[PDB]
C-alpha cells in the first residue's frame, strides 16, 4: 500500500470540458477515460494554455468481453449488440471538436465473428472521408490473432496502428486476459507492417506490475526486432480496490532513463513518464518526431 506524490491530479474543470462530455452523451458514445478512471481526464479533455482538447472514444459499448486484471472496464459474458450508428456518430463528434489528430479505441468483442474489425474500419473510413487531413490512431485489440481482422483495420486508411503488449512476457498471465499473450500482440503489430508497409506501429507497456529492469530491456529490444516504430511507458495505477495492487512506483528519473534507451534502439519516438498513457499527448508526439 503506497501512495505517490507525482501521480496526483485535479478534479475536472468544465470550461471547455462539458462540451465534450455532453457531446458523448448526445450521440450515446463512450470513452476509455471515464471507464478506466484515468487521472489525466482534466489535462486531456481541457487544454490549459494551447493544447487542442482531445479524447479517446471507446467503441462497441462500455462493457468488454474480457476481464483484464489491470482494467476497470465492465466485463460481461455477452455484451449488448453493436450500434450501427456508432461509426457515423463518432465521425461527426471528432470533426465537431476541431481535432487534427484523433485516437480511437474499443473494448474487446470476442462474441463478434470478426472481433469488430469491420466496425472499427467503418469508423475510420467515415472519419477520413469526412476529413482527409485528420490523423487517426486505432488502439486495436488482438482479435485473438485473427490475421484477416488485423488486415481489415490496417487497410482502413489508418495512420498509426496501435496494439499494446501491456507488460513484459513473464507477467502476461497475471495482468492480461488469457486470450491475450505477448507473442500474439507482437503478431498484431508485425502483420500490420506486412499488409500496410507504410503504417506506423505503436505499443504501450506498463511499469509497476512486478517487472524488473532486465525484463523491460528484453521487451523493448524484441519490439524493435518486430519493427515496431513507437513505444509508450507509464506507471500502472490501481483502478479500484478489486483490481491488482501496485508493486513498485517507478521513479521519474528511471522513467526518463528508458526514454534514452528507446532512442538508442531506434524507436521513432519513445514517450515515457509516470502519467504517460497510450494516447497521452499522442498528437503532440506525432508533430515532434514523425513529420520528418
Amino acid at each position: 500500500l503506497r501512495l505517490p506524490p507525482w501521480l496526483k491530479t485535479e478534479i475536472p474543470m468544465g470550461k471547455n470540458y462539458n462540451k465534450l462530455k455532453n457531446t458523448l452523451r448526445n450521440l450515446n458514445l463512450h470513452t476509455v477515460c471515464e471507464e478506466a478512471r484515468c487521472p489525466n481526464i482534466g489535462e486531456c479533455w481541457g487544454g490549459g494554455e494551447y493544447a487542442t482538447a482531445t479524447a479517446t472514444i471507446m467503441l462497441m459499448g462500455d462493457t468488454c468481453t474480457r476481464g483484464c486484471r489491470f482494467c476497470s472496464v465492465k466485463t460481461a459474458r455477452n455484451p449488448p449488440p453493436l450500434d450501427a450508428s456508432e461509426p457515423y456518430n463518432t465521425a461527426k463528434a471528432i470533426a465537431e471538436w476541431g481535432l487534427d489528430y484523433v485516437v480511437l479505441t474499443s473494448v474487446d468483442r470476442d462474441d463478434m465473428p470478426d472481433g469488430g474489425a469491420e466496425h472499427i474500419a467503418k469508423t475510420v473510413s467515415y472519419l477520413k472521408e469526412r476529413n482527409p487531413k485528420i490523423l487517426v490512431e486505432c488502439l486495436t485489440p488482438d482479435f485473438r490473432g485473427d490475421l484477416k481482422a488485423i488486415e481489415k483495420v490496417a487497410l482502413s486508411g489508418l495512420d498509426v496502428y496501435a496494439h499494446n503488449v501491456e507488460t513484459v512476457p513473464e507477467l502476461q498471465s497475471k495482468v492480461r486476459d488469457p486470450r491475450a499473450n505477448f507473442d500474439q500482440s507482437l503478431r498484431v503489430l508485425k502483420h500490420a507492417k506486412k499488409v500496410q508497409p507504410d503504417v506506423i506501429s505503436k505499443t504501450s507497456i506498463m511499469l509497476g506490475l512486478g517487472e524488473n529492469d532486465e525484463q523491460v530491456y528484453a521487451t523493448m529490444k524484441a519490439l524493435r526486432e518486430a519493427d515496431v516504430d513507437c513505444l509508450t511507458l507509464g506507471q500502472y495505477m490501481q483502478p479500484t480496490r478489486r483490481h491488482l495492487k501496485v508493486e513498485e512506483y517507478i521513479t521519474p528519473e528511471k522513467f526518463k532513463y528508458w526514454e534514452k534507451v528507446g532512442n538508442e534502439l531506434g524507436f521513432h519516438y519513445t514517450a515515457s513518464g509516470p502519467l504517460v498513457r497510450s494516447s497521452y499527448k499522442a498528437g503532440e508526439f506525432f508533430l515532434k518526431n514523425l513529420v520528418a
Partner: peptide
C-alpha cells in the same frame, strides 16, 4: 464532507489512483 458529484468521480479511498 465531499460532494456526491466529486465522490462518484473521486475513486476508492484506501484515493486508489
Amino acid at each position: 464532507g465531499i460532494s456526491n458529484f466529486a465522490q462518484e468521480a473521486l475513486g476508492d479511498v484506501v484515493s486508489v489512483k
